[PDB]
Amino acid sequence: WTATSGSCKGRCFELQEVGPPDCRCDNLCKSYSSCCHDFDELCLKTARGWECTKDRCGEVRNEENACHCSEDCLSRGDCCTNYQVVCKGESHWVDDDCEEIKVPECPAGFVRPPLIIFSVDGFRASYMKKGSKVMPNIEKLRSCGTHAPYMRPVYPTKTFPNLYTLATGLYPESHGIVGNSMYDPVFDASFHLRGREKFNHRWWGGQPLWITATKQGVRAGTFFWSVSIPHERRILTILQWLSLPDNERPSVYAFYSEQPDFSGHKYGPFGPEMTNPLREIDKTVGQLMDGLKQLRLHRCVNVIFVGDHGMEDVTCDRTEFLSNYLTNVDDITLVPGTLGRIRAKSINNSKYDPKTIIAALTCKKPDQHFKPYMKQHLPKRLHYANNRRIEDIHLLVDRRWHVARKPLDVYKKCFFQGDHGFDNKVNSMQTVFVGYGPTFKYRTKVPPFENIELYNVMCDLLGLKPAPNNGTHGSLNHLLRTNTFRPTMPDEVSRPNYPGIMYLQSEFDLGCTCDDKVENKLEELNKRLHTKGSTKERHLLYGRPAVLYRTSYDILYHTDFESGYSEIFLMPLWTSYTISKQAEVSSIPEHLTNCVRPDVRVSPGFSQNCLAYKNDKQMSYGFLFPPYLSSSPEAKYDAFLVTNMVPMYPAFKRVWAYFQRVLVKKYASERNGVNVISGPIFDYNYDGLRDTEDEIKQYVEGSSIPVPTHYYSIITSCLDFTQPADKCDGPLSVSSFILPHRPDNDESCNSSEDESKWVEELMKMHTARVRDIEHLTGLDFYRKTSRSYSEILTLKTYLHTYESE
Ligand SMILES: *[C@@H]1O[C@H](CO)[C@@H](O[C@@H]2O[C@H](CO)[C@@H](O[C@@H]3O[C@H](CO[C@H]4O[C@H](CO)[C@@H](O)[C@H](O[C@H]5O[C@H](CO)[C@@H](O)[C@H](O)[C@@H]5O[C@H]5O[C@H](CO)[C@@H](O)[C@H](O)[C@@H]5O)[C@@H]4O)[C@@H](O)[C@H](O[C@H]4O[C@H](CO)[C@@H](O)[C@H](O)[C@@H]4O[C@H]4O[C@H](CO)[C@@H](O)[C@H](O)[C@@H]4O)[C@@H]3O)[C@H](O)[C@H]2NC(C)=O)[C@H](O)[C@H]1NC(C)=O
Ligand SMILES: Cn1c(=O)n(Cc2ccc(F)c(F)c2)c2cnc(Nc3ccc(C(=O)N4CCC(S(N)(=O)=O)CC4)cc3)nc21
Ligand SMILES: [Ca+2]
Ligand SMILES: [Cl-]
Numbered sequence: 001w002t003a004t005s006g007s008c009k010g011r012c013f014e015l016q017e018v019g020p021p022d023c024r025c026d027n028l029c030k031s032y033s034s035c036c037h038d039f040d041e042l043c044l045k046t047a048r049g050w051e052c053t054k055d056r057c058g059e060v061r062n063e064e065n066a067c068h069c070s071e072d073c074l075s076r077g078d079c080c081t082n083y084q085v086v087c088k089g090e091s092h093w094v095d096d097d098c099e100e101i102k103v104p105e106c107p108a109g110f111v112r113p114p115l116i117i118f119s120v121d122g123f124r125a126s127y128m129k130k131g132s133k134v135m136p137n138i139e140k141l142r143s144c145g146t147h148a149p150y151m152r153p154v155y156p157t158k159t160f161p162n163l164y165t166l167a168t169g170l171y172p173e174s175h176g177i178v179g180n181s182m183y184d185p186v187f188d189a190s191f192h193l194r195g196r197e198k199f200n201h202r203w204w205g206g207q208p209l210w211i212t213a214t215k216q217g218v219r220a221g222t223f224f225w226s227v228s229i230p231h232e233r234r235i236l237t238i239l240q241w242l243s244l245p246d247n248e249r250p251s252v253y254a255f256y257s258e259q260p261d262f263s264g265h266k267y268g269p270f271g272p273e274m275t276n277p278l279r280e281i282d283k284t285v286g287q288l289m290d291g292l293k294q295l296r297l298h299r300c301v302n303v304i305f306v307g308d309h310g311m312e313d314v315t316c317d318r319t320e321f322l323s324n325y326l327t328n329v330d331d332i333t334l335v336p337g338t339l340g341r342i343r344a345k346s347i348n349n350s351k352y353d354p355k356t357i358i359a360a361l362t363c364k365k366p367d368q369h370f371k372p373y374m375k376q377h378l379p380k381r382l383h384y385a386n387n388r389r390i391e392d393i394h395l396l397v398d399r400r401w402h403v404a405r406k407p408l409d410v411y412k413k414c415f416f417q418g419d420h421g422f423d424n425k426v427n428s429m430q431t432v433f434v435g436y437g438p439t440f441k442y443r444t445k446v447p448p449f450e451n452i453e454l455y456n457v458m459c460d461l462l463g464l465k466p467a468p469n470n471g472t473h474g475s476l477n478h479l480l481r482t483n484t485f486r487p488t489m490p491d492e493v494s495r496p497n498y499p500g501i502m503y504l505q506s507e508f509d510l511g512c513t514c515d516d517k518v519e520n521k522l523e524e525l526n527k528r529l530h531t532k533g534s535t536k537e538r539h540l541l542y543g544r545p546a547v548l549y550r551t552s553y554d555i556l557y558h559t560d561f562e563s564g565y566s567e568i569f570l571m572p573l574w575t576s577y578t579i580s581k582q583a584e585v586s587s588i589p590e591h592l593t594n595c596v597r598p599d600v601r602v603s604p605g606f607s608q609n610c611l612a613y614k615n616d617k618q619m620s621y622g623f624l625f626p627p628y629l630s631s632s633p634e635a636k637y638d639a640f641l642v643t644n645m646v647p648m649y650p651a652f653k654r655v656w657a658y659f660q661r662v663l664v665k666k667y668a669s670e671r672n673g674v675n676v677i678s679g680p681i682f683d684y685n686y687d688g689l690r691d692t693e694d695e696i697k698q699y700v701e702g703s704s705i706p707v708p709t710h711y712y713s714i715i716t717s718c719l720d721f722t723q724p725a726d727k728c729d730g731p732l733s734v735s736s737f738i739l740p741h742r743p744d745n746d747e748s749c750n751s752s753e754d755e756s757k758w759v760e761e762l763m764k765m766h767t768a769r770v771r772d773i774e775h776l777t778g779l780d781f782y783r784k785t786s787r788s789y790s791e792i793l794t795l796k797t798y799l800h801t802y803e804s805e
């Protein structure tokens with residue numbers, strides 16, 4: 001109940017919301033059906049439109065008008081945004097030359113440059129080039145300020161998850177808004193685009209920027225506008241708030257536009273009908289900039305122009321139906337469209353079985369346009385598993401397609417021509433970022449980055465300490481002229497042991513054999529030097545990784561590779577080696593096929609054993625440094641040390657052996673040498689964070705050898721590929737992956753073919769940032785380079801996406 005009999009007189013777009021049953025006058029009151037009876041009359045004036053005309057100049061103030069052109073309008077703060085242009089001979093902001101803003105030029109009483117976030121729905125990255133002729137205000141922000149060629153959204157590429165990630169710096173699995181539609185089984189409640197459940201604060205986790213600001217004494221405008229409030233009124237309201245007295249005036253504001261998304265769904269991303277919505281949003285930007293210029297704030301405020309996601313061509317006929325796969329289609333509930341989420345229709349149905357659903361949906365039709373996954377098996381880069389609102393069964397839908405439960409759902413729920421929501425590496429889903437103002441750089445292009453990084457920068461722009469989030473603070477320092485955040489590298493928690501030769505061969509009873517009984521003082525000193533680290537500068541190019549948790553581990557040096565060997569998990573945490581452009585690939589010699597050799601530096605008690613592998617009929621093993629890339633026949637023996645062995649399913653060994661035998665040398669050829677760091681990851685609770693030992697669900701049978709859930713590799717070279725990886729003077733280039741360690745290749749529909757037809761495609765799907773691997777391992781990489789720490793933070797957030805231009 002609301003007592004709508006109260007009045008909005010002197011309260012229009014009040015900043016503090018009042019509690020029921022008192023009636024409201026704030027920018028969300030319409031959404032709650034709770035505005036005072038006179039809100040439209042007082043707060044949503046429209047008389048005479050949004051623009052001054054010559055005949056209105058110096059008019060007697062009429063309080064009924066939408067905006068004013070009377071002499072007192074600047075002091076009242078309520079002129080139409082074109083007032084000074086029409087009535088005072090001034091230029092529109094867009095017509096002015098750009099001039100570098102070296103320092104804030106702010107009116108007296110301003111304690112900091114305000115921040116205005118201008119967010120646009122469905123603004124695909126390529127609109128900046130393709131719509132350039134019709135968006136002169138946005139093009140001026142872009143060219144004069146700091147811009148990226150695109151910004152990567154989070155998955156799913158829908159509005160609610162992305163706007164709330166922009167506001168929090170958190171992945172959707174952590175902030176809790178994991179779709180536009182959700183069921184929470186603990187609450188037994190459903191969140192939808194339509195209706196009141198979505199207003200309950202229990203869905204919304206993390207700490208969004210407006211709360212961060214308020215808690216730290218920085219006042220905020222309200223960031224939500226009821227959809228029926230026209231954009232012109234939203235802009236005027238922002239400009240009116242910016243005329244409040246200092247102690248009442250917010251320092252951070254947000255505008256959101258439902259366009260161009262609304263028209264893109266109707267017309268497709270590049271429908272001819274899309275020019276007008278792009279022109280209209282540009283005109284709104286121009287209203288804001290003209291208004292700021294009026295207030296003498298156009299060289300004071302930082303403006304961020306940012307999208308939530310892009311838009312792809314999607315039509316009703318490109319729909320896959322689960323009724324063409326499942327015999328049992330009425331026993332499931334599907335969240336449908338550009339992703340699928342499946343759960344049981346009834347929790348009382350004890351016949352429901354996820355394994356049989358997944359099997360029925362796996363590689364059943366030759367050009368199948370979706371792929372099923374249990375959520376823990378999705379690419380780790382999507383960070384889309386650790387939330388009870390994310391169903392265990394997920395369908396990743398191909399770009400341009402939908403999935404639905406039955407055909408009738410498509411015509412009893414063609415209309416639309418555009419949609420979005422697909423994997424966030426898809427080109428059409430990319431969106432936009434421009435920052436303009438005194439704190440951003442001038443005429444600067446920055447590389448693409450992820451929207452999770454922006455919260456920390458918005459906090460930097462406002463002098464706020466960010467709440468804990470998934471950005472890497474400092475990775476976007478290169479966007480900023482000032483207010484940079486200068487982090488220190490984390491301190492190493494565990495220092496390595498450096499074992500020498502401590503055990504005789506007969507102390508080991510591992511059930512291993514090797515044909516290595518072969519025959520020299522010239523070479524003898526050389527072998528000793530290699531084991532004490534003489535080649536370590538060649539193979540450990542950026543310092544040893546730091547271990548940021550408490551554990552026991554040993555550094556082991558070899559001619560061709562260096563490793564950090566865990567005494568707790570019985571295998572390397574990391575193995576580092578460099579492969580030059582000139583390196584040769586060799587075979588594993590016939591007589592060494594099953595060779596595994598005790599490591600006389602590491603106790604039998606802290607070693608794996610071959611008998612466990614023999615007995616475990618499902619599990620085999622592989623090596624982290626590949627025997628194929630040994631520098632000589634003699635050095636190859638080191639590759640078969642028990643301290644270089646890791647548990648591998650046979651199906652996974654197909655993938656791993658092709659990576660090691662074919663792809664590493666391909667990359668060294670293309671990149672002019674590569675440095676490779678590889679290792680295991682354990683994430684049995686799919687939280688994106690390193691497991692402790694007591695979280696491990698699977699061991700090699702009869703042993704305490706834990707089975708990794710994934711294997712990673714970080715592949716680094718010189719950005720200037722005229723310099724070899726091991727003699728690089730300048731910035732680096734990296735690509736990384738986190739491959740799921742699975743007992744089958746059901747993910748790869750073409751896996752019965754030769755590895756040359758499917759393995760690199762799998763690897764591309766499971767591309768990763770170095771930072772993802774850091775979270776999953778508790779390791780910190782790139783400790784000792786010639787590069788600035790912020791540059792290295794940027795490198796650790798890079799994702800190699802494998803999309804065309
Ligand atoms: C991305 O960045 C984020 C933010 O930094 C990282 O997430 C943090 O990760 C931490 C570790 O996973 C986690 O720390 C835990 O916090 C517990 C207290 O949590 C509450 O309070 C905070 C602070 O205000 C709040 O933010 C939390 O918000 C979560 O939950 C609410 C409602 O339930 C949601 O609205 C909200 O969206 C958010 O949910 C997300 O996180 C939770 C986990 O907290 C997930 O379950 C959700 O799916 C969703 O992802 C909470 O309101 C604290 O109690 C924990 O301590 C336990 O473990 C330690 C082990 O050392 C032990 O000492 C304690 O005793 C305790 O264990 C006991 O409880 C166990 C569980 O029942 C039990 O099994 C044991 O036997 C013990 O009795 C822990 O410190 C932190 O909460 C989140 N924060 C957020 C915002 O998500 C995230 O990791 C980053 N991601 C990557 C990939 O890097
Ligand atoms: C979820 N969230 C936030 O975290 N903030 C705050 C914020 C966060 C970051 C910013 F950067 C910013 F500035 C503000 C928001 C501010 N406004 C809105 N308004 C919406 C959202 C969706 C729909 C809708 O129902 N749909 C999207 C539009 C389509 S359309 N185009 O088909 O109408 C229909 C579905 C209608 C209105 N949502 C917000
Ligand atoms: Ca984990
Ligand atoms: Cl959704």
Ligand SMILES: [K+]
Pocket residue numbers: 613614615616617618619620
């Ligand atoms: K075996």
Ligand code: NA
Pocket residue numbers: 745746747748749750751752
């Ligand atoms: Na397969």
Ligand SMILES: [Zn+2]
Pocket residue numbers: 122261262265420
């Ligand atoms: Zn949309």
